[PDB]
Amino acid sequence: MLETPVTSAPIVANYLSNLPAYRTGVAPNLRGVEIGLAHGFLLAGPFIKLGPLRNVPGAAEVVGCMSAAGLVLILALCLSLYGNAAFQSTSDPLMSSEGWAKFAGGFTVGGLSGVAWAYVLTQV
Amino acid sequence: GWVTFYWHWKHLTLWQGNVSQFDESSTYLMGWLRDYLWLNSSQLINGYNPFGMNSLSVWAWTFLFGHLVYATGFMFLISWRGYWQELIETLVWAHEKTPLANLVYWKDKPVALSIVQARLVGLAHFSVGYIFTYAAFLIASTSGRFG
Amino acid sequence: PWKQPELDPDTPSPIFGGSTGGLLRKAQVEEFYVTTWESPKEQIFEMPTGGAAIMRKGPNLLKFARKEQCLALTTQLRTKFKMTPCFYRVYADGKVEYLHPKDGVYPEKVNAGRVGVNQNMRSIGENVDPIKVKFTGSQPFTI
Amino acid sequence: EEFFQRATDAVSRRESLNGFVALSGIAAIALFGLKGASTLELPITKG
Amino acid sequence: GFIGSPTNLIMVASTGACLFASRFGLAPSVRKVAQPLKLADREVIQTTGDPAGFTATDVLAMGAAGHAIGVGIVLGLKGIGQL
Amino acid sequence: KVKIAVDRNPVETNFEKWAKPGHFSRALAKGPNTTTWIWNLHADAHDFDNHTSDLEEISRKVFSAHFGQLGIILIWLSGMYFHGARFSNYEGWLSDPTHIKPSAQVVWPIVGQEILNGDVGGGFQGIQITSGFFQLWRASGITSELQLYSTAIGGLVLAAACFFAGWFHYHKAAPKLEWFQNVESMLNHHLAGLLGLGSLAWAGHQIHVSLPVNKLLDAGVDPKEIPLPHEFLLNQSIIADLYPSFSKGLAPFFTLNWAEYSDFLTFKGGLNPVTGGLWLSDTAHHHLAIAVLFLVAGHQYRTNWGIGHSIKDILESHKGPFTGNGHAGLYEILTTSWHAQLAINLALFGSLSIIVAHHMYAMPPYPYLATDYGTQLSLFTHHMWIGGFCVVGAGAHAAIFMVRDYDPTNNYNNLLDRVIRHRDAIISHLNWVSIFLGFHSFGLYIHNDTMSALGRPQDMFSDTAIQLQPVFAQWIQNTHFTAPQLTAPNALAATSLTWGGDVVAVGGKVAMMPIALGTSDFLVHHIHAFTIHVTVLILLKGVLFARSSRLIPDKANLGFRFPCDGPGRGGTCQVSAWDHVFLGLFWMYNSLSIVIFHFSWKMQSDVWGTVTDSGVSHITGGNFAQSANTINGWLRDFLWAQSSQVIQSYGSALSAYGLMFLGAHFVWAFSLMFLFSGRGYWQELIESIVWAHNKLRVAPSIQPRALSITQGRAVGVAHYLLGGIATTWSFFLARIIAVG
Amino acid sequence: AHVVKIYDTCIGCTQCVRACPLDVLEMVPWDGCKAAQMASSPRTEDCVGCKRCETACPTDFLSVRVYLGNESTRSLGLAY
Ligand code: CLA
Ligand code: CLA
Ligand code: CLA
Ligand code: CLA
Ligand code: CLA
Ligand code: CLA
Ligand SMILES: CC1=C(/C=C/C(C)=C/C=C/C(C)=C/C=C/C=C(C)/C=C/C=C(C)/C=C/C2=C(C)CCCC2(C)C)C(C)(C)CCC1
Ligand SMILES: CC1=C(C/C=C(\C)CCC[C@H](C)CCC[C@H](C)CCCC(C)C)C(=O)c2ccccc2C1=O
Ligand code: SF4
Ligand code: SF4
Ligand code: SF4
Q1: What's the longest Cα–Cα distance across chain E?
Q2: Ligand found nearest the CA of F286
Q3: Which atom of ligand 8 lies nearest, measured to the CA of F705?
């Protein structure tokens, strides 16, 4: 009930509106793909930065990239677990059961794509 | 803890051959604190250090582990319910009134642990820390100088 | 009372800014409670969900997420100004249920109309031992 | 718009996604050690 | 402290300017306070033969302010090489 | 408008109320029937807001209680001066302050405790004191024990005067409510006379007494050969040849030629190399400038002569657009509520004590103060703990004001109402930042411990593996080291030696040396920030949720100090604001314990030590750069490497410390069952004991009861804090006396 | 929900109802006491178990009793 200039700014509302989570109309698989791409791309960084084999040249990038891909896989598994636990029973289609399942599939696809993109970007 | 302190110190002094040390040192509690708790902990805490590592590194680690679980038992024992219930209420408001994270919601409402549950969890952490700490100290002291 | 009053959502809310201890997502999913009263003059009171508000001269309507907040506001208004308010409970489907003055004379009085329920006609300590009621689903105090 | 739509078509369903993530995790975990380790000089199979 | 010394001259000029200021506007006296400016006010303290409001507390306060302004200006000029 | 308002003889000076213990409250006026009454008699004894609803009588009681506390403090100070006068070796210490330990307590030989009278030096036997009173008396120009005797007699006289003042201003001439409510007059008089005039008087004492005596002491002459301070006061020849500017005789002050006073009003930063303390002329010019600034500040508020500012007008004028009514009702709050003023005073006094601890470990403002490592450590720790207790009591009395003295009629859209209106956001963000700080500090420590135990020294967050160097602190240190170079050109040296520079040593021991900040320093500083953040979260949650919450909407009607609201709503134990303060007391204890542990290890490893021809050899050899990054390092290289003196103190003069150490552990254990358990178990055990005493007809007429839940929590936190503080006190003092 | 049981030892002093923060108790006419009042609990599903009614009971032992168990949204005092 307590509106703030932070939570009611037009710029903040427009920045939240065009995000894949709060998009007006977009199929949930595309939202999952964008979510996975962005979050895998940011997650690959800390894994290649200060991993267990950071001092080893060449091995650091591949080890961090597979660590990020594995973490993306666990995140997709937990996303599917949330979808099965919360939406088992019965107007936004993403919050539906099969919509959230398609979102999870798009999320793991986008996460693998983002990990591969981070690999091919840090290789060059 | 008292019976195991007595057994451990008497047997350690017997194995070292300095039974007179236990005879003239178990009389006063400073002897218990110094000649048993402080003297025999030198090899335990030196399991890992910036200098290196000996075979008792795992015992030092689980000794600190036991002290930490004892501390978490204190965490669950001193405070009882109401602060945690109000804190969880504030966290519920924070989660409900934020963008990009209010889409995912809990199926079961987060609540503070019950007072009986508080006593049980504090007792469990206390006992686990007690057991792990004394097992670490006992095994490390009896194995660092004997075989 | 003589006739149970009906909740009017069009009654004006008291003068108040933004609220933080107010309605959560439980209001739009489960029941939420609504307290109404009839202020004879303009005065400042303290809400149980935050700071201070000013009630308008006339009908005043407030919304809370808990019945305890409604009764706390009710007893604050009764002790401070002798206001005699009343609160309803509104479910998710819109069902309105009358809660506090069930006979309209407040539970401190009797009204000679209520029926005493959940009352044991024996003294406390005369209940049977838990061995007497075992594997039956009945507690010693429920008989 | 054709891309990223049929990519998840065979994995959108809950059973297929769960089976795929379980198979991939088990395969990566089994590859770890005898194939994942001992190639990046991991200090557990050296001695 | 010397009679006719430049430090004494500038601090005496500052004190005299501060004294003559509140006699006609500018500085906040007892009868002129406001937030940014001068606004009319009471007297309370008798001025003891002084026209308008120029009582003993006024001359005490403004003499203290003038002495302080003078010593501050003198020491600031002495720090930068002037008088 | 502002005038003295005093009622003549409102309370008769009689002993009729001393016979009846419970008389201030109607609940205890009926006499005792259970034992908790006794505890209530010792609980609501000074809760004057509960005894009467009249603010005038409460203000009179507060005035008289302050007079009593001042009399108690003056009695304690007179006792300190008397102990320095008779049972001390201050005269022997003045000859060689670098070889005789300061001692001012002598015990009676009764049961073998005469071994506590250790060989401190100078042909004296006693307890080595760490209060630094010797350095304070050396800074004050005190030479003989006659001056200490006279100071003790004057302190006793002033304490008797303060007690008489309390009795008089309560029973005989009690000030009215309008007298206390003159906040402008109080502020003006306190800024001009209590602080400004006191600073001017101390500056005059330093200029006319302390500076010549300290100069002659640093010159190396005998203390008995030093002329008495009145000889410096009256005859101008000695002060003239000691300081040539005194030959002018107050001419440069009135002629504005203050630069001629540069000989005895200096700005030489750093420490005096003769004694390792702050320059006395620097302190004299400092207190003179402080006196002038406070004299200026004391003529700000309008009282009776038109000119001056108005506190209410200033508060009401400062209103921004994002805050609604800007500081509107706070003037009426702070002129009617004693507890809000108590909260503000306690917060600022605790913060001031923290600044005092930091700024006298940094600059020792006393001759031969830095050489005594034990005195510096004890003073730092003591001021630290006093500040922590005061800032806890600040939140406590703020919560008391919120429960009792808060009025929603006067607070509709002001700052306090808006803080209450977004308290949930405040507490949630504070909780989040507390969790983030705890993770990224303590998890860093656990990470270092694990990767040390896993054989990965290159994976640690240490000074050699992963450098998380404090770049901001290092930059500030470099800037303040160059502060006299460009930004303060009139300062001869740096304001302190902690930033950088050479090493000042006195008597072969390091007085002050530059302090290097590394990865361990960043880790412990962020740990301290996390602990302070959590304590702030606890106290702010207690203050803001003292009146109401979604869990409990009528918490204001339950009072400030209630145990619980029953097991309802899943359980509502420790939901009161008092219980929040009780919980935050332990967090304050943990925070300051870690702070003083960091202080002790840092000065023992990188500051204190001895100076040889090869270089500076510290006490612990500088292990803080390599051992303070792990919890095991704190266990072994700080807690086990030290505390060997405490356990081996037996048979020496330090043994009582070890005794206290063991006793402290006992008290720290003895609190736990007051902190654990409840009341029903002890009540049933007391019932069984009552049956036992009833069988023998020795049951008391006053019914014994178990302690209250709030009472049990208070007893537990008090014994826990006492045990922990005494443990740290004994361990610190024994370690710093045996090897310091 | 919790179970609130009221026995015949109640004197009809209406203290338990006044101390109730959720309007669970009520007073009904009776003949077993001088005040001709007896406590009743017709709204026991709204009780949280705070035991404030037991604190206000003036009779020895307790004429009103609260037994915890089977916590719900209303019994747990949750606003969410
Ligand atoms: C007993 C259970 C267990 C086991 C077997 C492991 C095993 C491992 N953990 Mg550990 N860990 C555990 C419990 C366990 N963890 C717990 C309980 C905690 C929390 C206290 C941690 C916290 C922890 C941290 C913080 C880190 C590890 C790391 C590691 C690795 C050690 C270094 C290494 O071999 O790099 C081998 C590296 C590889 C890339 C080889 C492949 C193995 C990967 C990691 C698994 C597969 C990835 C995933 C499925 C996505 C892949 C998708 C696709 C490419 C197939 C190793 C795989 C480190 C690590 O993996 O670095 C990121 C590390 O930094 N662990
Ligand atoms: C910051 C301080 C601190 C704190 C709070 C703790 C906390 C703990 N330590 Mg640790 N410790 C620390 C610092 C600390 N440690 C340091 C710096 C060292 C040196 C490296 C140690 C060395 C150490 C050892 C060697 C042991 C602990 C143990 C313990 C646990 C105490 C269990 C208990 O309640 O026993 C209750 C108290 C007792 C059982 C007796 C207290 C000791 C007395 C003096 C022995 C004599 C008793 C004798 C029977 C006579 C007494 C009878 C009585 C009637 C008078 C707990 C996890 C012990 C543990 O893990 O569990 C057993 C253990 O064995 N610690
Ligand atoms: C410039 C004048 C002046 C001075 C120096 C003081 C000094 C003091 N006041 Mg006071 N005050 C003043 C004017 C002054 N007051 C006025 C005008 C009012 C009314 C608006 C008040 C109202 C007031 C209240 C309500 C309270 C104080 C308190 C205090 C004490 C604060 C504690 C402290 O710092 O310990 C410093 C301690 C010492 C330096 C020890 C020596 C103290 C000596 C005996 C006092 C000498 C100053 C005294 C004012 C001289 C006049 C008294 C005369 C009739 C004999 C301190 C003694 C507090 C208190 O009661 O403390 C007892 C308190 O609660 N003041
Ligand atoms: C509160 C602080 C304080 C005090 C008490 C003094 C006091 C003194 N200083 Mg110091 N001084 C101070 C601050 C102070 N100063 C500061 C801040 C500076 C700046 C750095 C100096 C700089 C300074 C210098 C450079 C010199 C002094 C000197 C002096 C002496 C000269 C006295 C004088 O002319 O004053 C004026 C004093 C009076 C007018 C006396 C007061 C009026 C009396 C008490 C009236 C009594 C009437 C009574 C009711 C009737 C008799 C009663 C009887 C019948 C019982 C005196 C001992 C000089 C010195 O030592 O030479 C002797 C000297 O050379 N001082
Ligand atoms: C400026 C200082 C100051 C002042 C004037 C007050 C004044 C007040 N406080 Mg506050 N308080 C302060 C500081 C202050 N407090 C600080 C620093 C803390 C933090 C610890 C608190 C914490 C606090 C709480 C939590 C409460 C108060 C309460 C009160 C009120 C009554 C206190 C009473 O009757 O105690 C009577 C005196 C005692 C009970 C004796 C206390 C003795 C302690 C517990 C142990 C002594 C330790 C000792 C050093 C070691 C002994 C060892 C042994 C071997 C001898 C009163 C309004 C209470 C209240 O009702 O407020 C309205 C209340 O609930 N205060
Ligand atoms: C040393 C003992 C100890 C410890 C560690 C804790 C820990 C905690 N208490 Mg507590 N506290 C204690 C004693 C302790 N308590 C006692 C005795 C009291 C009574 C006065 C309190 C009073 C108290 C209050 C009043 C509050 C806390 C809060 C907290 C939290 C601190 C905030 C934070 O960043 O935590 C981070 C977590 C830790 C530091 C725990 C260790 C984490 C390690 C590094 C593991 C890292 C993750 C790990 C790898 C994952 C494991 C995987 C596994 C599952 C397989 C945390 C849950 C506050 C809270 O709720 O949050 C702000 C709070 O408000 N406590
Ligand atoms: C016209 C006229 C006249 C005249 C008048 C006059 C001429 C006046 C003047 C006046 C004046 C001319 C005054 C003055 C005053 C002053 C003062 C009052 C001062 C003070 C001071 C002070 C207070 C100081 C301080 C300080 C110090 C010491 C230290 C630090 C710094 C300072 C500076 C701050 C006659 C009467 C004939 C007649 C009528 C008309
Ligand atoms: C032990 C305990 C009790 C029982 C303790 C009680 C009732 C207090 C006992 C105080 C005694 C009487 C103090 C005096 C002790 C000695 C008789 C005095 C010293 C005698 C020598 C000088 C000879 C509680 O009541 C309680 C309540 C709430 C939480 C925790 C606890 C708790 O832990
Ligand atoms: S009686 Fe004790 S255990 Fe029960 S709610 Fe109160 S404080 Fe908690
Ligand atoms: S408080 Fe007890 S005696 Fe009084 S009306 Fe309620 S049940 Fe009866
Ligand atoms: S426990 Fe509380 S809510 Fe339940 S009937 Fe008693 S007073 Fe009412």
Answers
A1: 46
A2: 4
A3: 7
